[PDB]
């Protein structure tokens, strides 16, 4: 609905790189369920489980058969291959789930959905006001406004809940930017194209070692480096935020700046939990702040009175 | 229609979870069609239906051709393969589907939905009501409202209808819960990528016992223990519930917290159908039920009639 | 449209049936063109067409290639494989559709149509009406009201049109399922895994006699069994309508047991086709028949008229 | 648009019948070109170009690698089978967009069209009319109906076009079903299972006839077995329709039955093209011409007037 | 948007014509990526690059595997086969594209979509207008209405842009049609079947010559039949438009056929661009000439000033 | 929404271009997964890592298994082909999304798109005012516009944002293109069907060099040699904007060209981004701007007032 206005600058670039960190894991997931075959040939000469090496030439014959060489793969596949080549694209997803879901969380809990729902009512009202105009520079219908911001100012006075909420998104989409550099780039390195395996399975092919191939390999570590790179620059905006988020402080707000402009100082500053809540309706356009400056002067709800 | 109110904040959790739960359903059953073949290999050498064990090395022929394999894949695949590994996709979706339902039913069946629909009609008519302010803190169309939420009170006053099907839902959408876990925890062990089997029909290939191998099993593996996690935070969910929905005892309403703030007492506890149906849309927010506490007194009906 | 209310309870848990019963017939046919070959080996040793039974143990050679294997599948599996297998969800597909259209050829049909068109349309209003609320307890456009309801009441009174068609269709919808069960019962087991085949094409092979396997004998069973199943308790619902439909002997109306609650007397019953198409409704919701029993009274008429 | 009335009940099962028709040309085309390949083994012992006969019995050896049973596959799958084995899918389509279009290309000639769009127009107002109540028991915005209705009867009295494209569908949507089943059923038989060719291309193979198999061709006989019996009970709707618009030589209206009931004879019968749009409305329903039955006559102009 | 009545009855022939010559593009199309396949034999007797000819039978042994086979194949598809077989599906729809977005692109040009945008408004209000009914047999409103047309024919009336770019669509979507014949028909012997190739790989395969076929030569061949017979029938449209368009000179309009129905004379002709925008909407329906033919005379602006 | 006035003739075709260069990388892409194989023969003799050259004649037997070809295909696949060959449809897909994606980030920023919201607002309601009727030949409402508009272009005229931004996209949608251009005709020759590699590889296969084919590079010359061409038209498009970005300089606007036709006089040259976002609505279409050369003039404003 209309919460557009309510979400800053950073939180518009993060929607869409969490849409293309999904992009390259769903696509990335349909190629490695239809294929990412390996192919396993065994090493006839070998020197301490490595394939050491070896008129006109001609091939090398193992006498197996195609089921063999299908066995030898799965086994191949199942054990000598890294869990981080297998279900890189089923791990990006279950990650960009989160780090999606846990923006729109805050949207759904019925105790902060709420308080969000009518916040954004009374603001998206006041912005449109002919007395604004007046004052920038039939009324008992907007007296009752008055007596309803003045409620909804007092009803929402009593602790912080979305300023809690809101400060837990930016403190656990932090951490899992730390926890996802932890491990994703300390296991890139597992997957590549050429795999050498030795699975013990000498009773059914007749060989000890087999060589083996990986071809998606080189084209997962371009994915994953795309990945990750697409994740410090998420991890970038978060933590400018944190930055912007603890130096202000805006337990309440500061109307010192317009209290000149509009020249009055019968509006007080909001104590807490309204702040915050224009806070950073201001911190997306600086207008609907100021036009929401004059409902709360007590002269400005006299001569509206008149 | 108009029924987010009328769902608390656990129900609202558990819509999202019955859907993942089917999202890995649909894609482990196109995954199980499309493929979730078996490969198997005889065992020459064998000590009690068990493979035992056996210059440079050559492979092992069988002498076999390629749908002497595939024959006894099929059959290694029906008989010595527990039937869990194969409808495990199928068959969650069946029990999600019916968790889902479940839900919806009480929605759909004419002798609950008639009763839904008018009660949620006149709260949200009376949420927006002019005379809920002045109370808070051309009448004779609200004196028709008054009547009609009198009306409304004794028409639904006989008895619990709703408050007995809300009542069953939460009560087979707990054992169901209890049945899954009696045996998707005692049948996931059965699955396993290494499998042997050994079904005589030495007429046709010349073998006994075959080795084979199931490539998904470790896929599975990941699914099932990713749905039954999937399956006890939904079962978490609904055990609350019913230490909430038995410890309140919510036969009538207690309209005794607000009283003190009208100061009026002429609004009587409602009898039964008529609180429940209230008693969770004050739970899912608190102000629905202050802006109904006043249609009730007779000196606000009285104050209404002036 | 605004149909809904037209359908009984009975006729609501039907639709989601037939739906259902269609998605495992879409499921098991692209899994059935995909797939559902055929796997067929020779029997070197044969007694009356049947495989009799026959250092390390080593293979069989029969001498044949892939087409040769490829070509007795096809007519293994044209010839010596029942109709029902094969064509199992071709089958349920058709006869779903029949289930389902018929229901709504009741709604199509423009001679009944009509009927349905405007009847609703009059209960629709009636249901909204400030009179019912006096009654139940510019007059000049209610009376034009009375003498739209008291035409359509002549108009419609002329015989039976819909309560013959939706006679028909309970009719029809039970002789099918009466039908089903006669002929999906007794060919459920020709459906099986091992399939034994001889179709006397030695001139290309060289065999005579040619044991197969079916993979998918065994999931066509569970569907089928699950079809089935799903079939019975869609037939249960529509026998007890034929129990409802004719113990009543609804061709009139019986408006007696609210001529006491309104005690007016001047209605009367309504004789043929304005009942039934009333009964359902009542049957569907009880209040919809109490605010139209006040339209038919001339009293009423009479104190409207005033 | 609002055409649903302009459409009688026997156009009303056509468009339905002409959905499945194409239905069963896009699953018989998508199952016809990622398959219906054809298997092929040659006659080691043939008698004028017919495969005449011939411890344990052991395979036949031709000698032939894969690709030239791949390469006789498409001779004798492009030469020796007939056309309409292989295009059935392709042509019911091809043939069923003809019946299908033909019924709209009627409302897309602008020349008709707009006739069509302005007739209903006032058809659709004049059903809803306060004055017809009276008659069939500010007038001066009713008296330009009456002009207009008056003037849209005298523009379009000359000729029938209309009429003349109405009869061209029904007289075109005939002759094809006239010549579907001159072809349809005399070229069903070609499709069979066992096919024999003989291709002359010893060169390369080595054999000069090869015996083949068709295995769709049991599936193309059920469709089009199917097909035609789908198109038969479409040409006897079209059947009776030419039984009916002849019969009745509806060159003009007959206003005779209502002119009774009316009592007024001051409505002359409509001359051409304005009784056959209007003629085919009252069999969708007889209704709507009776409600316009009162518009035409200067005596109820004459009482509208007042 | 309403331009509807804007396209002549050729051009609506020509819409639907452009979308089944993109059907058989996207069908032609999938059936060549997914398929067109190249099967390809060696010759191993030649006579100048032409496979002249050669107790019971038997194969003739090439000593190939399959990745020589599959080898050849896509040289002989590569090299020796035409270029049209292989795109032609490719090369219809880059053409279609043409043919339908050229039509189209004089609506989206904003020098002259603007144009048509506020032409087709002032006649579809003139339509409906209660003073052509007078005239074809608080008016200061309509007083505003002859002034915007005289506005509008006075701001229009400077030189030809529509006429200029209409003309240039009918142009080019003629000359195109003349060059898709100069090349589609030269280039539709070059599929066949039968195909030889001779490609100098003796170092690999060791043959010089294979005699080689192309499966879907016979179906391209009756999609080209059937394009191009798609493309004459429509290069017919487009040859009556430029007969149409250059006979009648259509620089201005002619009133003259009206000025004796109104008998008026006050009306001129419009000088150049605000007739042809009127010539073709006359040509669609001659009813919207009529009506726009009083807004024009002073002496009807005369009657509407009183 | 409503900013379909505010893109150019020139931003309207390359919303196009960018599609169809979209479309052929999507097309290119699941092309290149599907399949894009590479098959791969060995070469007996060789001189220098190319292979040199070598009754009737006999296939070259190599003594290979299809894993050992499929492993070969799959090295000679990674290492000795380029990665713009493999990798080209996915990178066109990454450039045209940035391409793309510049174009609407200037509508995405909320400290532009706030300013374009508005702007185009006052517009469009300026383009409907009975009173530019008269100029250009209850009124306090509309000084509340001449005040709106006054305040707004004293809102705006503080430097310029849009007209940096707007100014930022086709200076980096030129870069691009020149950089496009120094490496995609730079590598279109590195994709070619004739492969050869060298891969060192002998222990497991017995060869050194194996002669490859490359099936679909005839297929990405073409996309590619498309591509480009799809890409300098583009680039001629932006090249002309630079060319009319600054040698207009619309730092401020000129309304000298209608203070002659207004001959007011009282309307002064808009001072920064007032111009701007007025000076391209002129340049799509010259009448938006002539019907807002009037709200600015104090002497219209006077004329209003009265
Ligand atoms: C006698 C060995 C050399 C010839 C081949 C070689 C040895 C094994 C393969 C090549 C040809 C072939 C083709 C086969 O079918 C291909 C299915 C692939 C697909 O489904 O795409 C099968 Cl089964 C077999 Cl045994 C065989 C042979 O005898």
């Given at each position: 609905?209309?919460?557009?206005?309510?979400?800053?600058?950073?939180?518009?670039?993060?929607?869409?790189?969490?849409?293309?960190?999904?992009?390259?894991?769903?696509?990335?997931?349909?190629?490695?369920?239809?294929?990412?075959?390996?192919?396993?040939?065994?090493?006839?000469?070998?020197?301490?489980?490595?394939?050491?090496?070896?008129?006109?030439?001609?091939?090398?014959?193992?006498?197996?058969?195609?089921?063999?060489?299908?066995?030898?793969?799965?086994?191949?596949?199942?054990?000598?291959?890294?869990?981080?080549?297998?279900?890189?694209?089923?791990?990006?997803?279950?990650?960009?789930?989160?780090?999606?879901?846990?923006?729109?969380?805050?949207?759904?809990?019925?105790?902060?959905?709420?308080?969000?729902?009518?916040?954004?009512?009374?603001?998206?009202?006041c912005f449109?006001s002919?007395?604004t105009?007046?004052?920038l520079?039939?009324?008992?219908?907007?007296?009752?406004?008055?007596?309803?911001?003045?409620?909804?100012?007092?009803?929402?006075?009593?602790?912080?809940?979305?300023?809690?909420?809101?400060?837990?998104?930016?403190?656990?989409?932090?951490?899992?930017?730390?926890?996802?550099?932890?491990?994703?780039?300390?296991?890139?390195?597992?997957?590549?194209?050429?795999?050498?395996?030795?699975?013990?399975?000498?009773?059914?092919?007749?060989?000890?070692?087999?060589?083996?191939?990986?071809?998606?390999?080189?084209?997962?570590?371009?994915?994953?480096?795309?990945?990750?790179?697409?994740?410090?620059?998420?991890?970038?905006?978060?933590?400018?935020?944190?930055?912007?988020?603890?130096?202000?402080?805006?337990?309440?707000?500061?109307?010192?700046?317009?209290?000149?402009?509009?020249?009055?100082?019968?509006?007080?500053?909001?104590?807490?939990?309204?702040?915050?809540?224009?806070?950073?309706?201001?911190?997306?356009?600086?207008l609907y702040?100021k036009r929401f400056?004059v409902?709360?002067?007590?002269?400005?709800?006299?001569?509206?009175?008149?």
């Amino acid at each position: 609905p209309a919460y557009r206005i309510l979400k800053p600058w950073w939180d518009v670039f993060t929607d869409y790189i969490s849409i293309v960190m999904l992009m390259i894991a769903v696509f990335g997931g349909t190629l490695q369920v239809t294929q990412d075959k390996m192919i396993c040939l065994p090493c006839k000469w070998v020197t301490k489980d490595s394939c050491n090496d070896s008129t006109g030439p001609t091939g090398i014959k193992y006498d197996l058969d195609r089921h063999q060489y299908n066995y030898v793969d799965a086994v191949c596949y199942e054990n000598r291959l890294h869990w981080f080549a297998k279900y890189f694209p089923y791990l990006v997803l279950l990650h960009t789930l989160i780090f999606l879901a846990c923006s729109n969380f805050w949207f759904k809990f019925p105790r902060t959905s709420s308080k969000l729902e009518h916040f954004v009512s009374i603001l998206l009202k006041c912005f449109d006001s002919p007395w604004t105009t007046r004052a920038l520079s039939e009324g008992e219908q907007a007296k009752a406004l008055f007596e309803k911001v003045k409620k909804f100012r007092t009803h929402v006075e009593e602790g912080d809940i979305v300023y809690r909420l809101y400060m837990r998104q930016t403190i656990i989409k932090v951490i899992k930017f730390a926890l996802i550099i932890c491990y994703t780039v300390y296991y890139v390195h597992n997957i590549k194209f050429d795999v050498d395996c030795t699975v013990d399975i000498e009773s059914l092919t007749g060989y000890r070692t087999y060589r083996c191939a990986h071809p998606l390999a080189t084209l997962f570590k371009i994915l994953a480096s795309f990945y990750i790179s697409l994740v410090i620059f998420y991890g970038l905006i978060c933590m400018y935020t944190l930055w912007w988020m603890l130096r202000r402080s805006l337990k309440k707000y500061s109307f010192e700046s317009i209290r000149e402009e509009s020249s009055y100082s019968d509006i007080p500053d909001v104590k807490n939990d309204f702040a915050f809540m224009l806070h950073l309706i201001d911190q997306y356009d600086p207008l609907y702040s100021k036009r929401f400056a004059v409902f709360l002067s007590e002269v400005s709800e006299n001569k509206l009175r008149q």
